[PDB]
Amino acid sequence: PVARRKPEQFIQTGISTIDVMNTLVRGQKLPIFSGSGLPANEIAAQIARQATVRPDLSGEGEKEEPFAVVFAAMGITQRELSYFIQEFERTGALSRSVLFLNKADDPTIERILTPRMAL
C-alpha cells in the first residue's frame, strides 16, 4: 500500500457536472450507483468517447498519457452490442481499447471470470 503514489489531480473528460461539480480524480473508484430503470450504455459510452484526460491546466505536457480504453459490461443484450458497434465505430476507441463483454448468451462460467481479465 506503501508503494502507491498519492492523488493530486483530476482527469479531464469534457463532461460537465461529473468533473466539475463533483470531480473524477485519478485512481478513484468512480461508482455509478445508478438510476437503473434507465440503462447505462448511452450515458456510459457517451462519456467514454467524449472523455479524455489532458493536463493542459497543469502546464505539464499532454503527450504522455497513452489513453487506454478498457471496457467491460456483461450479460449483454445484443441490442446494446449494436449500440456498441454504433458508438465505437466512430471513435478510435473502437481501437485503442478492449471490449470484453459477456453476451447475454455467454455461459455463466465465463461470466464469472470476466471481471478479472482486462483488470
Binding site: 471513435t91 478510435g92 473502437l94 481501437s95
Partner: protein, 62 residues
C-alpha cells in the same frame, strides 16, 4: 406680441429636441447592429473550425 414670442421660442426648442433625441436613438440602433453582426459571425466560424478539427480526427483515426 411678447406673448407669442415665448410660444415661438418654446415650440422651436422642442423641434430642436426631437431631432436631437432621434439622433441618439439612431446611434443606439446603430450600435446594436455592429455588435450583433459581429456576434453572429464569430460564433459560427468558430463552430465550423471545431467541426473540422474533429472531422479530420475521425479520418485520421480510420
Amino acid at each position: 406680441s411678447k406673448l407669442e414670442a415665448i410660444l415661438s421660442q418654446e415650440v422651436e426648442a422642442e423641434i430642436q429636441a426631437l431631432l436631437q433625441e432621434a439622433e441618439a436613438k439612431a446611434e443606439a440602433v446603430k450600435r446594436e447592429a455592429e455588435e450583433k453582426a459581429k456576434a453572429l459571425l464569430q460564433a459560427r466560424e468558430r463552430a465550423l473550425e471545431a467541426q473540422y478539427r474533429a472531422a479530420l480526427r475521425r479520418a485520421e483515426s480510420a
